[PDB]
Structure 1
Amino acid sequence: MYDAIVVGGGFSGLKAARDLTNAGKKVLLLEGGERLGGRAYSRESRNVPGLRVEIGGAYLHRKHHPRLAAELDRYGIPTAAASEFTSFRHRLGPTAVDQAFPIPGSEAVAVEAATYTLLRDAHRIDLEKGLENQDLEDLDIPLNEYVDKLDLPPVSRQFLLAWAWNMLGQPADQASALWMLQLVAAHHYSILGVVLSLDEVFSNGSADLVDAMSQEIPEIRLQTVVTGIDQSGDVVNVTVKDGHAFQAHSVIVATPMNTWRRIVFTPALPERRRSVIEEGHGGQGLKILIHVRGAEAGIECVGDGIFPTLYDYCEVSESERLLVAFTDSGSFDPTDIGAVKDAVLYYLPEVEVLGIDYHDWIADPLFEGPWVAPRVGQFSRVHKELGEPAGRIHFVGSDVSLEFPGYIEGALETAECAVNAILHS
């Protein structure tokens, strides 16, 4: 039996396990899959032999993501930007300008005013309290309704909606305004910052950091799916799909929120958590790597397409590239390549699609979703509580970060807190 069992071998689990180990605790890490890293998943391209790609989490910004920056410095892990953006091919209407910030002068006043309104609203959020504890319910409404009250002209309206679609992984009618404002608050109260945090990538893949961290973790079991966590006795018992149990004084749940509902907790989790847990969050983010021919380097496209964003990812050859598109899996079927072709040619009518690569995170039983985003009304009912301990079971992960939810940084942050909580008695 162990001081602590960590369930899940993403960045959160890995951090918690390593740090508890270095503190002299006896730790076991159980990972249900065949690999470590979770929603950070670098691997060989399905389309391009010998090419390493990120199929989940990839981007970081050292200034918004200091714990991650610390990890990188700690292990000497190189980063860079994946591409310079120099060619802008927007679909925002005839008055848009082809630049990174495509808003024309005739919209400037409208943007100014909306900027003030969004940031005012964002400043209502205190990041330590939880979204359900601050009288923020009036903001917990469908994003499209919120944006309708800003009454933006066409370019700025579509620009904001596109990036919101991209970033939340939900269409505007399903996204919560409060959640959009949450991401603005997490970026030091900045709208710009949300998109500007796409700043660098791992030069050798996320696996670089995953492997570094795992090297400091003495006991790991892969292919070990936790099905049960029972703290009815003096010591927590963790049952596993095989049926061969492990015991510890403390258990860290570092699996995705949308998979909690498949674990049997004993006793049952506190009742106010239960409904949201059963439902799951509404995240439907979809990231598609697109192998193309005839694309110039450095393309960025933002617009009103079924892909709100489409931008440069990497050089394959003199004539071939990968692009990345974001949409959501409720709106778009990535296995309909004809659809892919249509969505790309909308922005880039000269380009030929050669193929696509993605991971169906929502269909994967180890995840049941991409990154976190609430359904409308969820997190103004319960949010902080999701990542609070239930007796000796701690809940960590990006999904439950108050400080940086949906980011690698949030995984690290939450791990920090569980480790400290465990070290204090």
Structure 2
Amino acid sequence: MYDAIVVGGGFSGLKAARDLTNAGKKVLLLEGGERLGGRAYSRESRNVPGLRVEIGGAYLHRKHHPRLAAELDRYGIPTAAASEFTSFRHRLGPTAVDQAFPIPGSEAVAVEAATYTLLRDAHRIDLEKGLENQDLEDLDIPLNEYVDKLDLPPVSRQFLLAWAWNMLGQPADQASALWMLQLVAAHHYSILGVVLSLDEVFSNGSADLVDAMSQEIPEIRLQTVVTGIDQSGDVVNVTVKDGHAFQAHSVIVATPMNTWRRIVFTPALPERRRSVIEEGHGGQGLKILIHVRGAEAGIECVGDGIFPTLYDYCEVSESERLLVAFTDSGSFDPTDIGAVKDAVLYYLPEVEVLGIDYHDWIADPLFEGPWVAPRVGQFSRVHKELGEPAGRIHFVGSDVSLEFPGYIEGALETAECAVNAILHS
């Protein structure tokens, strides 16, 4: 038997398992798949042989993300500034300006006012309490309705909705305004910070840190899918798809929220939690790497396209590049290459699409989702609860972070909490 079993080998699981190990505990980490790192997934390009790409999480900001910064410093892991953008090719209408902040002067007053309104709303949110414990229900409404109340003129209206489509992985009519405001809160109550936190990448890929962390973890089982967690006895029993059970005093669930519904918990999880767990969150984020010819370097495009954002990712050669597009998988089918060409040519009519690369996170049974975003009405019913212990079973992950949800920093933050909870026992 173990002091602790950690279920799931993303950053959250890895941290928990390492930190518990180093505290002198006997830890087992069970990972269902063939790799560690979870939604942090560097690998070779499908389009360009020998090219290493990030197919999930990539970007960080040392100052919004201090735990991650610490990890990077700990292992001497190199980061670099993302390629700064020099060419702006927006589709925000004829009054827009082609720079990084594309709002014209004629909109300045409206933006000023909307800025005050948004930040005043975000300031209603205390990040410690949970979104369900703060009388925030009036904000838990479709983002398109919230934004209609702001009565923004067209460039700023469309610019705000494009980055919110990007950031949430949801179209405006499925996104919750409260959740948008939560992201604002999470970035020291800054609308601007939401985009500015896309500051740096791993020079050598996220696997750098994955590998550094795992090397400190003594017991790991890959291809071990947990199907059962049973704390009806004195010691927790963890059953597994094709193997013998494992036992521990404590279990950490460090798997994605939208997979919890596939595990049988005994006893059943607290009732307040059950519906949302069954529903899942509504995150439909879709990140497409696009291999292209004819693109100048340093392009950034924001607009009203089916790709709200399209921007430079990496130089492939003197004529070729990868770009990255964000949309959502409800709205867009990345396997329809004619659709990809149309969405790119909308911004960049001179560019030829050579291929795309993505991961279908939503179809992956180890995930059933990209990053977290609630359906309208979910997180004002239940939110903080989702990341609280049920007896000896802890829940961690980016998905349940109050502080940094949907970011790597959130995976680290939740793990930190569970480790400490456990070490006091």
Contact 1:302 1:310 in 2 (8 A): yes
Q: CA deviation at 1:82?
A: 2.8
Q: Counterparts of 1:74 and 1:133 in 2: how far apart (Å)?
A: 37
Segment drifting more, 296-305 vs 74-83: 74-83
Superposed CA RMSD: 0.3
Pairwise CA distance, 1:416? 0.3
Pair 1:47-2:47 in alignment: yes
1:287-317 per-position Cα deviation (integer Å, ceiling 9, x unaligned): 0000000000000000000000000000000
Normalised by the length of structure 2, the TM-score is 1.00
SS at match of 1:355: strand
Secondary structure of the residue aligned to 1:322 is strand
Deviations along 1:352-404, one digit per CA (max 9) or x if unpaired, are: 00000000000000000000000000000000000000000000000000000
Distance 1:47 1:205 in 2: 17
Distance in 1, Cα, partners of 2:244 & 2:125: 45
**Structure 1 residues 20-62: Cα deviation after superposition (integer angstroms, max 9, x where no partner):** 0000000000000000000000000000000000000000000
CA drift of 1:84 comes to: 1.7
TM-superposed CA distance for 1:341, in Å, is 0.1
State the match for 1:109 in structure 2.
109
For residues 164 and 295 of structure 2, the distance between their equivalents in structure 1, rounded to whole angstroms, comes to 25
Q: 1:243, CA displacement in angstroms?
A: 3.6
Q: Deviations over 1:189-234 (max 9, x none)?
A: 0000000000000000000000000000000000000000000000
Aligned residues: 425
On the 8 A contact 1:16/1:416 being kept in 2, the answer is yes
SS at match of 1:59: coil
Deviation at 1:244, TM superposition (A): 1.1
Tell me the distance in 1 between the aligned counterparts of 2:339 and 2:60. Answer: 30
Report the counterpart of residue 208 of structure 2 in structure 1: 208
Consecutive unaligned residues in structure 2, runs of 5 or more: none
Deviation of the 1:348 alpha carbon: 0.1
CA distance in 2 between counterparts of 1:244 and 1:192 reads: 50
Alignment correspondent of 1:405: 405
Structure 1's unaligned 5+ residue stretches are none
- Cα deviations across residues 228-270 of structure 1 (Å, max 9, x unaligned)? 0000000000000014100000000000000000000000000
Aligned to 2:306: 306
In structure 1, distance between residues paired with 2:381 and 2:229: 25
- Work out whether residues 169 and 285 of structure 1, in 8 Å CA contact, stay in contact via their aligned partners in 2: yes
Provide the rounded CA distance (Å) in 2 between the counterparts of 1:30 and 1:49. Answer: 31
Q: Distance in 1 between matches of 2:225 and 2:392?
A: 20
Distance 1:355 1:115 in 2: 39
Matches of 2:200 and 2:403, distance apart in 1: 20
Write out per-residue CA displacement over residues 116-162 of structure 1, whole angstroms, 9 at most, x where no aligned residue: 00000000000000000000000000000000000000000000000
**Cα distance in 2 between the residues matched to 1:256 and 1:181:** 23
Within 1, Cα distance between the matches of 2:335 and 2:413? 35
Partners of 2:81 and 2:346 lie apart in 1 by 26
**What is the CA distance between 1:81 and its match in structure 2?**
1.9
Shift of 1:164: 0.1
Q: Which runs of 4+ in 1 moved over 6 A?
A: none
The 1-side partners of 2:84 and 2:185 are apart by 27
Q: Structure 2: how far apart are the matches of 1:118 and 1:424?
A: 40
> Deviations 1:312-362 (Å, cap 9, x if unpaired)?
000000000000000000000000000000000000000000000000000
Please state whether the residue corresponding to 1:57 is helix, strand or coil.
coil
1:399-421 per-residue CA deviation (whole Å, 9 max, x = no partner) reads 00000000000000000000000
SS in structure 1 of the partner of residue 185 of structure 2: helix
Answer whether contact 1:82 1:314 (CA < 8 A) is retained.
Answer: no
Aligned-partner SS, 2:238? strand
Report the Cα distance in structure 1 between the residues aligned to 2:323 and 2:229, rounded to whole angstroms.
Answer: 42
How big is each residue's C-alpha offset from its partner over 1:172-193, in whole Å with a ceiling of 9 and x where there is no partner?
0000000000000000000000
Give me the whole-angstrom Cα distance separating, in 2, the residues matched to 1:128 and 1:78: 32
What is the match of residue 98 of structure 2? 98
Name the TM-score, length of structure 1 as normaliser: 1.00
Counterpart Cα distance in 1 of 2:143 and 2:45: 35
CA distance in 1, matches of 2:381, 2:4: 31
Structure 2 distance, partners of 1:421, 1:287, is 35
Structure 2 equivalent of residue 391 of structure 1: 391
